[PDB]
Amino acid sequence: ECCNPACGRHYSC
């Protein structure tokens, strides 16, 4: 998972 806003296009939460 990538829940931080900085994940950007990688956001997956």
Curated annotation (Swiss-Prot):
Keywords on record: Acetylcholine receptor inhibiting toxin, Amidation, Disulfide bond, Ion channel impairing toxin, Neurotoxin, Postsynaptic neurotoxin, Secreted, Toxin
Tissue: Expressed by the venom duct.
GO cellular component assignments: extracellular region; host cell postsynaptic membrane
GO MF assignments: acetylcholine receptor inhibitor activity; ion channel regulator activity; toxin activity
InterPro entries named among the record's database cross-references: Conotoxin_a-typ_CS (IPR018072)
Main location: secreted
Subcellular compartments: Secreted
Disulfide pattern: C2-C7, C3-C13
Family: Belongs to the conotoxin A superfamily.
Domain description: The cysteine framework is I (CC-C-C). Alpha3/5 pattern.
Function: Alpha-conotoxins act on postsynaptic membranes, they bind to the nicotinic acetylcholine receptors (nAChR) and thus inhibit them.
Protein name, as recorded: Alpha-conotoxin GIA
Organism: Conus geographus (Geography cone)
Taxonomic lineage of the native organism: Eukaryota, Metazoa, Spiralia, Lophotrochozoa, Mollusca
